[PDB]
A paper describes a structure:
The majority of traits controlled by rhl transcription factor [name] depend on [name], a dispensable thioesterase in Pseudomonas Quinolone Signal (PQS) biosynthesis that interferes with [name] through an enigmatic mechanism likely involving direct interaction of both proteins. Here we show that [name] and [name] form a 2:2 protein complex that, together with [name] agonist N-butanoyl-L-homoserine lactone (C4-HSL), solubilizes [name] and thereby renders the otherwise insoluble transcription factor active. [name] is a thioesterase that triggers transcription of the [name] regulon through a hitherto cryptic mechanism, which we identify here as involving a significant chaperone-like component that enhances the stability of [name] via protein complex formation. In common with many other gram-negative bacteria, two QS circuits use N-acyl-L-homoserine lactones (HSLs) as autoinducers, namely N-(3-oxododecanoyl)-L-HSL (3-oxo-C12-HSL) and N-butanoyl-L-HSL (C4-HSL), which are produced by autoinducer synthases LasI and RhlI and activate the LuxR-type transcription factors LasR and [name], respectively.
To corroborate this further, we sought to replace wildtype [name] with an in-silico optimized variant that triggers pyocyanin production independently of [name] and C4-HSL. Indeed, the [name]-designed [name]-P75, in which 75 (out of 241) residues were mutated with respect to the original sequence, could easily be produced in E. coli, even in the absence of C4-HSL or [name]. It crystallized readily in the presence of C4-HSL or [name], but not without these ligands. Co-expression of [name]-P75 and His6-tagged [name] revealed that the interaction between both proteins has been lost by the introduced mutations.
Numbering used by the authors:
A (entry chain A), B (entry chain B): 6 to 241
Amino acid sequence: GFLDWWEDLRSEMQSITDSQEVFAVLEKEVRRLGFDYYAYCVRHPIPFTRPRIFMFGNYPPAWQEHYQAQNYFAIDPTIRHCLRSGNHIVWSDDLFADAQELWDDARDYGLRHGATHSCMAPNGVMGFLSVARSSPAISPHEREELRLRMRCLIELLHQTLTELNHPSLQPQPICLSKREREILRWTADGKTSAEIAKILGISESTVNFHLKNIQKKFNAPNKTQAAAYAAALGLI
Amino acid sequence: GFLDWWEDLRSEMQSITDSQEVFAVLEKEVRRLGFDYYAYCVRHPIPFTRPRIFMFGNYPPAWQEHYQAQNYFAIDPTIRHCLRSGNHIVWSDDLFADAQELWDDARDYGLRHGATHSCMAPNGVMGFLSVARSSPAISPHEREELRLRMRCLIELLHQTLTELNHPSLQPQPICLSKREREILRWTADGKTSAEIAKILGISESTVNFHLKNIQKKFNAPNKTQAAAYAAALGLI
Ligand SMILES: O=C(CCCOc1cccc(Br)c1)N[C@H]1CCSC1=O
Ligand SMILES: O=C(CCCOc1cccc(Br)c1)N[C@H]1CCSC1=O
């Protein structure tokens, strides 16, 4: 049954040593779900205007090249940084209402039925797992089991790739002290250096010294970027 | 049959129309897992220094009031906003190495074995589900199934309470324009008002006009808070 399937896949993936074999197992499991193609996307939260995005999968190469040529990542709703009930969305005309050209084109490449499941690690990194096929529409009776299996797949995928330290997952490596973490929290809450100095019982000079060190660790021009980047990375 | 249990529980929860009944079902499912008590905690990401937290559960009231009196929420490792390797942690002496008074007290109240699962909505809200009991240690053979069941429980719990519009899951609404949003995004990436005026081809007066409005929407005294709040809420 389901638990048998899950335990066998855990064992199969726990025995992996190279990232290449992870996606090979994934490809097999996606076909077992009844789909021809899958994609995996890692969206880091920063920079806010041009977020680091890593993309993987086995879509027909002709579709990859077209998706890239048309810059569809910038409008694709399936990888939007947004809230979806159940972290799951079955593809539909409504879903692409504001991305009509992408949906028009994708169906012309045979990607006519599918779903995307998403997860978000507490470090701002979001994963998206898509499955797609040309013909059978997704049946209502298979929808909920598909969501459950996809959730299991994307969780095991993300965990396995993190444990092999795949470059895609390693987020901006920042290390903040307890003191400067606390100063940045008050800063992100809108306090000035003077207020923070009174709150912590230290000199305004010491606060600014810490803010300067924080800004350098973020390579930021000002405290606004540092506080926003720390929030998005889950550091405060 | 794991799948029938899930489908049975979904139907049960979907028939719920009062939040009280949701926790009643949850309490029964936690006993079915073999535990005496549960807690459910909703952690909003802001204010960074004093986050909006809602707590539910059926821990003995004597423990509830002791936990609150001691402010253990602030140091509790099970509800820390951090990256749990599987969104799941079984309680251990190691986990509480930095919170020894909490763990000593908890065991003195009979909370000696348990686990916490976590989920993060992509709007910064984090859910935590704990189960606890006094006697049998969690055995190696039941761990992976407990993880899976707890993940299903917290996901269904969060979904059901969301669709009932429970006030704990409702975040304070910020209605940001398409223009306000891109100005705040650039600002979070460290750009100045003068710079932003060049990117959008408008006056620096007009940028600060939007920023003063954005700041009002966040009830924020500066743009640093507006940007960090927008980031943590998933709004930019
Ligand atoms: O599955 C996704 C998420 C984006 C990742 O897809 C891609 C696109 C190009 C190369 C690679 Br590899 C993966 N988007 C869907 C929406 C409908 S058609 C499509 O590609
Ligand atoms: O489960 C958690 C985190 C959530 C605590 O939730 C609580 C605490 C007090 C009253 C209520 Br209601 C819920 N902490 C554990 C650590 C070991 S004992 C304990 O409470």
